[PDB]
């Protein structure tokens, strides 16, 4: 017998004698919605509780408030820590916090729910890791951004570059023209290139 014989290594998956070798279990049928890979379900976009400034959790916590008669102010702003803060309870931070290293591309989306008469221009500037997040509309517009006209197109989808932490700000280019409080809906998902390794256990 070689060293380490008669030990029980919990990570050693071995075949074992069945205690009921004759019992034929009930046959397996095809139930719909099988998930083979967790990268199948992080592809689905889920709401971000971005308004953590609320003291209790409620559906309003999924709503980023936007206000009329605001130009050059900041709408929202977030870090990309996928284990604490605002992302810890989303589907991304709920599966990501089971592992240690998350190398993969993200798809970050927003949806405007205001009235059909309202319109606004928001700057979605993406600051990569290593720089300081913008604190005014000009540093953000001088960078990488998409000019999304909320009045025309109610939904924008932005592909965040491969990351393997960077900042994200929103600014009013023009004033919000109101009809004669509005809310923003933010969604997060993962691109199909999102790997996951060293599965851990939170305590």
């Amino acid at each position: 017998t070689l060293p380490g014989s008669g030990q029980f290594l919990t990570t050693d998956d071995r075949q074992s004698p069945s205690a009921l070798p004759n019992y034929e279990p009930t046959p397996r049928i095809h139930i719909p919605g099988k998930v083979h890979n967790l990268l199948e379900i992080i592809q689905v976009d889920t709401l971000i509780p971005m308004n953590n400034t609320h003291t209790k959790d409620e559906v309003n916590s999924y709503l980023i408030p936007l206000n009329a008669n605001r130009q050059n102010e900041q709408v929202f702003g977030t870090n990309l820590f996928i284990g604490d803060g605002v992302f810890k309870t989303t589907l991304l931070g709920e599966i990501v916090q089971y592992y240690t290293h998350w190398s993969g591309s993200l798809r970050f989306s927003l949806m405007y729910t205001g009235p059909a008469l309202s319109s606004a221009k928001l700057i979605l500037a993406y600051t990569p890791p290593g720089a300081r997040g913008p604190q005014d509309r000009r540093e953000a517009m001088l960078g990488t951004h998409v000019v999304w006209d909320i009045g025309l197109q109610s939904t924008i989808v932005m592909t965040i570059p491969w990351t393997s932490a960077g900042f994200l700000s929103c600014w009013y280019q023009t004033s919000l023209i109101l009809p004669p409080q509005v809310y923003l809906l933010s969604f997060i998902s993962a691109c199909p290139d999102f790997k996951l390794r060293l599965m851990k256990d939170t305590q």
């Binding site: 074992s16 019992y23 279990p25 998930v35 702003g77 605002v86 589907l91």
Partner: protein, 193 residues
């Protein structure tokens, strides 16, 4: 390959930590007692896997019988019951300090075990995810001193399959088999990075 369900739910967890005397304990097989395994199981509605128990018996100051009681067999009521000797209850005899290992097939009645059941057959009392019961007894006789044999059962789900992904659980548990709950989203302002 670490994100596959065969690897995510299929890791040996300790489903029960008991302590026997030289007397017995029965335990309904319920993997949802572990909030680390329960928090992984509740991201799916149905999950079907064959079971695999590795049982480690440790003394504290001998032979350990590990009996898997299938659905419908009577559980022991005394240490000297006739049910301990029933031929349909499989039992494994191993020494204290060693470890036992066996596998039980899919003993549910549906095509998968029911992690959640929206209805009545007791909203949570369902017989579809009942895998049976485990009884343990130190086979000895009037030993002049009592030695407490701590038993550590390690179950590993193999051939894991999952369906109907569910929302992840944010809050703790209060009961077994019921979703009854007693702010998880921590407060930051909203514009500050």
């Amino acid at each position: 390959s670490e994100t596959d369900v065969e690897c995510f739910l299929g890791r040996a967890a300790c489903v029960h930590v008991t302590e026997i005397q030289n007397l017995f304990n029965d335990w309904k097989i319920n993997l949802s007692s572990l909030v680390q395994l329960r928090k992984k199981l509740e991201l799916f509605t149905y999950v079907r896997f064959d079971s695999e128990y590795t049982i480690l018996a440790t003394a504290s100051q001998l032979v350990v019988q590990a009996m898997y009681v299938p659905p419908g067999a009577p559980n022991p009521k005394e240490w000297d019951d006739y049910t301990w000797q029933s031929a349909s209850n499989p039992s494994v005899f191993f020494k204290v300090g060693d470890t036992s290992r066996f596998s039980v097939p899919y003993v549910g009645l549906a095509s998968a075990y029911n992690c959640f059941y929206d209805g009545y057959s007791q909203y949570g009392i369902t017989v579809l995810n009942h895998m049976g019961s485990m009884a343990f007894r130190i086979v000895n006789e009037h030993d002049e001193h009592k030695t407490l044999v701590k038993i550590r059962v390690y179950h590993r789900a193999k051939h894991v399959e999952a369906w109907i992904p569910r929302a992840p659980r944010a809050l703790p548990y209060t009961s077994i088999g019921r979703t009854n709950y007693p702010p998880v989203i921590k407060k930051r302002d909203i514009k500050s990075y």
